[PDB]
Amino acid sequence: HINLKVAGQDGSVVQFKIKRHTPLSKLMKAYCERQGLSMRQIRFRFDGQPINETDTPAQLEMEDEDTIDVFQ
Amino acid sequence: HINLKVAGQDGSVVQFKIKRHTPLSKLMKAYCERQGLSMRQIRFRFDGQPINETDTPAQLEMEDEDTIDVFQ
Amino acid sequence: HINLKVAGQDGSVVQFKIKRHTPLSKLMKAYCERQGLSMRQIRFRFDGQPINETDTPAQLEMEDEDTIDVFQ
């Protein structure tokens, strides 16, 4: 697994672990469930690029302790 | 204190700090309270072994930044 | 940004990132919102000193991976 941070605009940082070839939608759904948020209302980006349903950490060239940004 | 991670099957990783000779039930109860979960429905394991009410990090040979796995 | 930990008496550790010259009330409000807590009922301290509305990490001489303590 690699460890990823999900950072909100409020400064909150929530941690996940995910395998490099697993879709990031695993993480996005878990974030929403754990944080009581809706995909209808939030968006996830990595180094400015939107993350799609099937993108994986390896495809997006993510490394351990990288950060995903969440926006409204 | 040592720092411990509690990892769910969804990839969520939640952090605790606990003294080495304090029972892990402190951590288990705090996890349940903070995550809105019930002991009735979840179980905690460390390197495949169930964690009991009075087990301590020192007894289970846990070290800083180790991970506890949570299951349904 | 620097990374800060917010530690509860239950051993929970929640992470934030904040710029050094931004008021810590950003973090305090985010903690309360994310944790479903009220400022009416909790207090934040750093190395024994209460944190006020306009105190910044730089003013309080905080560094990456320092811990803020939360109390009832």
Q: In which residue are the tokens 């879709």 written? A: A23
Q: Sort out which chain B residues have CB atoms less than 8 A from A27's CB and list them.
A: 11
In angstroms, the CA A24 to CA A54 distance is: 7
Q: What is the DSSP letter of C55?
A: -
Resolution rounded to one decimal, in angstroms: 1.2
- Asked if residue B16 lies in contact with residue B51, where contact means CB atoms within 8 angstroms, the answer is no
Parallel, antiparallel, or unpaired for β A12-18 and C66-71? unpaired
Closest chain C C-alpha to A48 CA, distance in angstroms: 18
Q: How far apart are CA B71 and CA C20, in angstroms?
A: 39
Long-range contacts of C6-10 (CB under 8 A, 24+ apart): C6/C31, C6/C44, C6/C67, C6/C68, C6/C70, C7/B17, C7/C67, C7/C68, C7/C69, C7/C70, C8/B30, C8/C70, C9/C70, C9/C71, C9/C72, C10/B26, C10/B29, C10/B30, C10/B33, C10/B34
B-chain residues near C13 (CB < 8 A): 3, 15-17
Q: What backbone torsions phi and psi does residue B10 show, to the nearest 5 degrees?
A: -80, 0
Interchain proximity C8–B30, CB inside 8 Å: yes
Residues of A with CB under 8 A from a CB of C: 5, 7-8, 10-15, 35
CA-nearest of C69, C51, C66, C62 to C21 is C62
Asked whether the beta carbons of residue C11 and residue B34 sit closer than 8 angstroms, the reply is no
CA distance A7 to B43: 28
Among C16, C29, C33, select the one facing A13 at the smallest CB separation.
C16
* End-to-end CA separation in angstroms for chain A: 28
Backbone torsions φ then ψ of C26, nearest 5 degrees: -55, -50
Number of H helices, E strands in chain C: 1, 5
Method: X-ray
Name which of C42, C44, C47 is nearest C62 in CA terms.
Answer: C47
Calpha distance C36→C59 (Å, rounded): 28
Going along chain A from its start, the domains and CATH numbers come out as: 1-72 (3.10.20.90)
DSSP-assigned beta bridge partners for residue A50: A45
Which amino acid type is present at position B59?
Q
For chain A, counts of helices (H) and of strands (E): 1, 5
Query: CA-to-CA distance for C49 and A56, rounded, in angstroms?
Result: 44
Alpha-carbon gap: C13 to the closest alpha carbon of chain B (Å): 5
Q: Give Dmax over CA atoms of chain A in angstroms.
A: 29
C62 pairs with which residues across the strands?
Answer: none
Give residues with Cβ within 8 angstroms of C45, minimum separation 6. Answer: C51, C68, C69, C70, C71
How far apart, in whole angstroms, are the C-alpha atoms of residue A16 and residue A2? 8
| Residue in B5, B11, B15 closest to A30 by CB | B11
Which of B36, C3, B31, B71 has the alpha carbon at shortest distance from A35? B36
